[PDB]
Amino acid sequence: EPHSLRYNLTVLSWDGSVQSGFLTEVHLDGQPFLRCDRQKCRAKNKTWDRETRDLTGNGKDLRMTLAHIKDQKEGLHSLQEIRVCEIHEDNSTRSSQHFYYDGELFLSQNLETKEWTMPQSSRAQTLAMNVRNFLKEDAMKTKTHYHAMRADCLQELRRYLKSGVILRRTVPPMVNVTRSEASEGNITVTCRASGFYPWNITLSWRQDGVSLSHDTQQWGDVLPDGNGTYQTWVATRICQGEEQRFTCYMEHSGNHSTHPVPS
């Protein structure tokens, strides 16, 4: 997985009237990490210094953006700016800016390439025009504003990383094999893996060291097991006295382990 930093800023209108409030949800390596509103910023402590200033900037600037949309359709409307940056395993960066209206995308900018893009869709295109016109002409944004947006985001990500809030801690699974009892001289064997992070795991019964097809096997979903860990299971039906012919195989984070049936 790469490192994610994401900001989710949100403003509201009631019959064309932009409300004083706004709300930014900051996600660090995909986990909720900050919630700021106009007032102040709250983790899930005055190290929330620079973010109170920055994100109130965007909030104000985004109330102004919503005031230039001419939907007028009565009642409650949302507008959203979502900035995302990633640092990849390979040291190359990813970065984008998205606007949602009533929770639907209508404008993106890739910040690596600086290429805007819109849905083909009558409303989607008029919206995009409203906001791209406000960005070029009224707000008077230089190409350099988008380079900064890109750089601001990544230095922030690198700063959080450095601080040591992000732990890429592997939690290896607990494994257990079990058996369902004699019906017509047959047994179900169950392999269970639990309390494991990250999410990605391989788990498969084998007969004489060869994987069974996905079809002759029965599968748990990967469910949450608490604290940010997961659990799953795989199962197969076999004949009584073919037990030590079968083993459960598992890869998690370069740990390739094998558990036979309790005979």
Binding site: G16, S17, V18, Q19, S20, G57, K60, D61, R63, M64, L66, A67, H68, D138, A139, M140
Partner: protein
């Protein structure tokens, strides 16, 4: 002139007008009071030429512009009518006060909404 018209010490001087910016968020009423408390008043825009560096102001700020509702139009605190062509007025929030925003915009806000403000005193 090498010297900028007489201003408070620790205030910004541009073409003999004096300015200060306040980070302490206040509703319009409290803001006007604050400005007058300092022998000033909320920003009045009278000239794109003499106030051209208002183009370089980030974000939005209380400004001395009000909507007398039976007047059906905008004027400054002192009673001066707004020059046409000076400001672009945008409906942001339902209210009878306006926020200054850069490239000579006025965004309409509720007067009871706390916000940063700019004081000016004319030479």
């Amino acid at each position: 002139e090498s010297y900028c018209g007489p201003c408070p010490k620790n205030w910004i001087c541009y073409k003999n007008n004096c300015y200060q910016f306040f980070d302490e968020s206040k509703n319009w009423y409290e803001s006007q009071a604050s400005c007058m408390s300092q022998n000033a008043s909320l920003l009045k825009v009278y000239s794109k030429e003499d106030q051209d560096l208002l183009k370089l102001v980030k974000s939005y700020h209380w400004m001395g512009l009000v909507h007398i509702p039976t007047n059906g139009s905008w004027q400054w605190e002192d009673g001066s009518i707004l020059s046409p062509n000076l400001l672009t007025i945008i409906e942001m929030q339902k209210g009878d006060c306006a926020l200054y925003a850069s490239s000579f915009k006025g965004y309409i806000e509720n007067c009871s909404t706390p916000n940063t403000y700019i004081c000016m005193q004319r030479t």
